Antibody
Framework: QIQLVQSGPELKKPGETVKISCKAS????????MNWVKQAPGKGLKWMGW????????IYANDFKGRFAFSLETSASTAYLQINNLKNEDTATYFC???????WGQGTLVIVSAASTKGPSVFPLAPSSGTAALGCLVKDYFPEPVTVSWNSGALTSGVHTFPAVLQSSGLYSLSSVVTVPSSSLGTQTYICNVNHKPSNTKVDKKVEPK | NIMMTQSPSSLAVSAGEKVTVNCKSS????????????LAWYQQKPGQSPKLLIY???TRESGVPDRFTGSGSGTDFTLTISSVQTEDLAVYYC????????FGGGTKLEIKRTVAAPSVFIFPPSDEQLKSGTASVVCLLNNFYPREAKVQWKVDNALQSGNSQESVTEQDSKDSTYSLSSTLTLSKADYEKHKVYACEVTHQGLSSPVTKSFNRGE
């Protein structure tokens, strides 16, 4: 069973350095050159370059000349990718991928952000004025992820929890919306249940008409 | 550098349709001495590593379903799905590896459905939020198709720019639609400088643009 196992997700402040690990397994490491591929959030695959795993020589794509370095520890059958002086544009998933065949690491996600760990503020998106919309603004937290549920799970139909976005501050933000029948406002109680395991915080917010 | 032009970049399909993705090399990837094309096809699903479907342009990777085949030679390559299934909804990439690596732009495969106008809702900031000095105004675009939609923010008729972020759901697995949030970020002092907050929505399915609005305080 051949596999590449990369190191875990990385959360880094601008300016810092990150060294990503790719551990190979199940074949003669030195016989196969290793490739590095970058994928920015939502974008295509970008070949960054290649390293000779016997002699150590690196070859870099023209866009990754400077700030990027491939290296080895052949004793341990490991390839390293180092990024110096991290920018916003280095936020991406980084893959190692071996020459010949179908082998790829699972990818290392790199987030660049000024933020430290912080749990969300949750604000009501209150219903308007025969179906109404309502929801919860989950703002100013870090890192990913948060889970949102509605009425402790009792309400799943009509729910949209959007993908998070990075604000300029480096803090994440999303909204959870639900469409419900107008007639139920003032009868039915709507609570959104936000959980953020990194900050170890849990928040419920009732959402009612203003 | 061998350049790789993949097309189309997006494809909307039904159960059982035949699907064709075309790759174009700027230089031949046929190595003359061994008559092999140094070309591969990958399927990649959200949050997953790319998965090798075909290499040497036409050899299928063991485990890939039979309905995938690659063909062509030299500069022109095609990936065919004889009969597409929901299992195959993914993004596909070509790869030349004769002279370094070059991936195509990628081809996204979605489920086609009838056009659907979005349901638009606008959400003012909460009083709780205003206490911290920032005001978030939220515009919801609910259950529409296709993905393309223009959201315009208007504060007191003044077109906003640079101060909003959008977010799109993935194509819904039950009714094949998308949803979009747009969030305008203002300071409490700017937010109270103005009265009429409007969200203006353009979409294939609306006869004309749709505005949802509210008056601060009312």
């Amino acid at each position: 069973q051949i596999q590449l196992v990369q190191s875990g997700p990385e959360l880094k402040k601008p300016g810092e350095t990150v060294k990503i690990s790719c551990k190979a397994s199940g074949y003669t490491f030195k016989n196969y050159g290793m490739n590095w591929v970058k994928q920015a959030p939502g974008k295509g695959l970008k070949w960054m370059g290649w390293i000779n795993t016997y002699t150590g020589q690196p070859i870099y794509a023209n866009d990754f000349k400077g700030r990027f370095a491939f290296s080895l520890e052949t004793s341990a059958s490991t390839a390293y990718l180092q990024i110096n002086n991290l920018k916003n544009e280095d936020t991406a998933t980084y893959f190692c991928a071996r020459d010949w065949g179908p082998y790829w690491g699972q990818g290392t996600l790199v987030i660049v952000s000024a933020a430290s760990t912080k749990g969300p503020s949750v604000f009501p998106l209150a219903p308007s004025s025969g179906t109404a919309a309502l929801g919860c603004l989950v703002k100013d937290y870090f890192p990913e992820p948060v889970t949102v549920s509605w009425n402790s799970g009792a309400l799943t139909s009509g729910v949209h929890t959007f993908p998070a976005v990075l604000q300029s501050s480096g803090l994440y933000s999303l909204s959870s919306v639900v469409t419900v029948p107008s007639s139920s406002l003032g009868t039915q109680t709507y609570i959104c249940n936000v959980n953020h395991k990194p900050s170890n915080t849990k928040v419920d917010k009732k959402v009612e008409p203003k | 550098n061998i350049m790789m032009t993949q097309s189309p970049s997006s494809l909307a399909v039904s159960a059982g349709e035949k699907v064709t993705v075309n790759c174009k090399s700027s230089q031949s990837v046929l190595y003359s001495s061994n008559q092999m094309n140094y070309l591969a096809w990958y399927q990649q699903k959200p949050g997953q590593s790319p998965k090798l479907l075909i290499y040497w342009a036409s050899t299928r990777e063991s485990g890939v379903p039979d309905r995938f085949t690659g063909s062509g030679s030299g500069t022109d390559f095609t990936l065919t799905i004889s009969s597409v299934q929901t299992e195959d909804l993914a993004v596909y990439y070509c790869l030349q590896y004769l002279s370094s690596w070059t991936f195509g732009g990628g081809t996204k495969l979605e489920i086609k459905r009838t056009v659907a106008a979005p349901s638009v809702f606008i959400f003012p900031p909460s009083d709780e939020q205003l206490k911290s000095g920032t005001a978030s105004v939220v515009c919801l675009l609910n259950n529409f198709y296709p993905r393309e939609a223009k959201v315009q923010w208007k504060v007191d008729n003044a077109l906003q720019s640079g101060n909003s972020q959008e977010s799109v759901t993935e194509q819904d697995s039950k009714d094949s639609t998308y949803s979009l949030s747009s969030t305008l970020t203002l300071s409490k002092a700017d937010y109270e400088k103005h009265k009429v907050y409007a969200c203006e929505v353009t979409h294939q399915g609306l006869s004309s643009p749709v505005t949802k609005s509210f008056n601060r305080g009312e």
